C-alpha cells in the first residue's frame, strides 16, 4: 500500500484499500464536551511507566515511532475503562504545518498543534499483531500539544530528529522516560474506536487526556523539518500527518471527571 496524507493518497482515499475506513467505530472523533457523560463507574487510571525500556526511534515515512521493549510488563496502562493489563509498545505524534492544526481528536471542534499517541496492547492476546485483531486489543493514550513553554521531557526526542530526517532512518533511543511527556492531570475522555492510520482496525479503547501539554515553538518547528520522503528523493516536509474527525455514529464518549 502507498497511503499518506497528500491530495492523491490522503485520508479521503484510504477507504479504497481499507474499507473499514467507513466503519462504525472509526477514529479520531470530535469530543463534544457538553454531551460527554461523566461515568462514576470508571476505575482509577494507572499509568505505570517506571520500568519503561525504550529501544529505538524510527521515521516510517508517516510519522516517527519511539519503540519500547514489550516482552515483559515494564510499562503498562491499567484501570480507567480497561480490563486487564496493556503494555506500552510505541509512541508517535501527529502534527500540523501551522499551530492551529495537527491534532486528530478535537475538543468542541478545537484543533491543537499536535497530538501524542502512546500505544498499548492487551497482554491477554500475547502479542501486538494478535491484539490488533481484537475489539479490545489496544489502548491508546492521546495527549494534546499546544504551543507555549517548552516540554523538557520532549527535548531528547527533538534533539535526535536530525538523525532520522528521512523515511527508513532509525537511531538508538535507549533510556527514554515517557513519564516526561504527561500533563499534571490524568482526567480523560474515553470511547471505543480505531487506529487512525491504515489499516484503521477497530481495536482501540481511546483514552484522551483533558489537559494538553505545552511545547515550545522551537520544539514543534523541529517536527516540521522531518521528511516524508526517503534520502535522495525530492523533499516533502513531514507536516499535517493527521486524519480529521470521523462520524461518531453509535458511540457515547464518557468522561472521568465531572
Ligand X SMILES: COc1ccc(/C(C)=C/C(=O)O)cc1
197 is in an annotated binding site: yes
**Min dist. Cβ of residue 130 to ligand X (A):** 11
Look at residue 128 and give its three-state secondary structure: helix
Q: Considering the rule CB under 6 A, would residue 85 count as an interface residue with ligand X?
A: no
List the x/- string, 25-64, binding to ligand X by CB under 6 A. Answer: ----------------------------------------
62 assigned to active site: yes
Tell me how far apart the alpha carbons of residues 196 and 140 are, in angstroms, rounded to a whole number. 11
Q: How far apart are CA 114 and CA 154, in angstroms?
A: 13
Range 163-194 burial, b when 16+ CB lie within 10 A, else e = ebbbbebbeebeebebeebbeeebebbbbbbb
| Residue at shortest CB range from ligand X | 195
Q: How far is the CB of 5 from ligand X (least distance, A)?
A: 13
Q: How many angstroms separate the CA atoms of 230 and 232, rounded?
A: 6
Neighbours of 6 (CB within 10 A): 11
Name the segment binding ligand X (CB under 6 A); options: 14-22, 80-88, 193-201, 216-224: 193-201
- Among residues 191, 5, 40, the alpha carbon closest in space to that of 105 is found at 191
Q: Among the candidate windows 39-47, 117-125, 162-170, 237-245, which touches Zn ion by CB under 5 A?
A: 117-125
Q: Is 196 annotated as a binding residue?
A: yes
Cβ distance 198 to 26 under 8 Å?
no
H/E element holding 14?
Answer: helix 14-17
Q: Binder to ligand X among 119, 157, 238, 239 (CB under 6 A)? A: 119
Cβ nearer to ligand X, comparing 127 with 162: 127
* Binding letters toward Zn ion, positions 66-85, x by CB under 5 A: --------------------
2 annotated ligand-binding residue: no
Q: Quick one: what does residue 116 bind among Zn ion, ligand X, none, with the CB cut-off 5 to 8 Å set by partner type?
A: none
SS3 197: coil
Decide if 80 contacts 41 (C-beta within 8 A).
no
| Residue 132 contacts ligand X per CB under 6 A | yes
Rounded to the nearest angstrom, the gap between the alpha carbon of residue 94 and the centroid of all alpha carbons in its chain is: 7
| Residue 181 C-alpha from the chain's centroid | 12
Cβ nearer to Zn ion, comparing 93 with 173: 93
Answer with the entry of Zn ion, ligand X, none that 195 interacts with (C-beta below 5 to 8 A by kind). ligand X
Footprint of Zn ion (CB under 5 A): 117
Binding residues for Zn(2+): 92, 94, 117
Footprint of ligand X (CB under 6 A): 117, 119, 132, 195-197, 199
List the catalytic residues: 62
Amino acid at each position: 500500500h502507498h497511503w499518506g496524507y497528500g491530495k492523491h493518497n490522503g485520508p479521503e482515499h484510504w477507504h479504497k484499500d481499507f474499507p473499514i475506513a467507513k466503519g462504525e467505530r472509526q477514529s479520531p472523533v470530535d469530543i463534544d464536551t457538553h454531551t460527554a457523560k461523566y461515568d462514576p463507574s470508571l476505575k482509577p487510571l494507572s499509568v505505570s511507566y517506571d520500568q519503561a525500556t525504550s529501544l529505538r526511534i524510527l521515521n516510517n515515512g508517516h510519522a516517527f515511532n519511539v519503540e519500547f521493549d514489550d516482552s515483559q510488563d515494564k510499562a503498562v496502562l491499567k484501570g480507567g475503562p480497561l480490563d486487564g493489563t496493556y503494555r506500552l509498545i510505541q509512541f508517535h505524534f501527529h502534527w500540523g504545518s501551522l499551530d492551529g492544526q495537527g491534532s486528530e481528536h478535537t475538543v468542541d471542534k478545537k484543533k491543537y498543534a499536535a497530538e501524542l499517541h502512546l500505544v498499548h496492547w492487551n497482554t491477554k492476546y500475547g502479542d501486538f499483531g494478535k491484539a490488533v485483531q481484537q475489539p479490545d486489543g489496544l489502548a491508546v493514550l492521546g495527549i494534546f500539544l499546544k504551543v507555549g513553554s517548552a516540554k523538557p521531557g520532549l527535548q531528547k526526542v527533538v534533539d535526535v530528529l536530525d538523525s532520522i530526517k528521512t523515511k527508513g532512518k532509525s537511531a538508538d533511543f535507549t533510556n527514554f522516560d515517557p513519564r516526561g511527556l504527561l500533563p499534571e492531570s490524568l482526567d480523560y475522555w474515553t470511547y471505543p474506536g480505531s487506529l487512525t492510520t491504515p489499516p484503521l482496525l477497530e481495536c482501540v479503547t481511546w483514552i484522551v487526556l483533558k489537559e494538553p501539554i505545552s511545547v515550545s515553538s522551537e520544539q514543534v518547528l523541529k517536527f516540521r523539518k522531518l521528511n516524508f520522503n526517503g534520502e535522495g528523493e525530492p523533499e516533502e516536509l513531514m507536516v499535517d500527518n493527521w486524519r480529521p474527525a470521523q462520524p461518531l455514529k453509535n458511540r457515547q464518549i464518557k468522561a472521568s471527571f465531572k
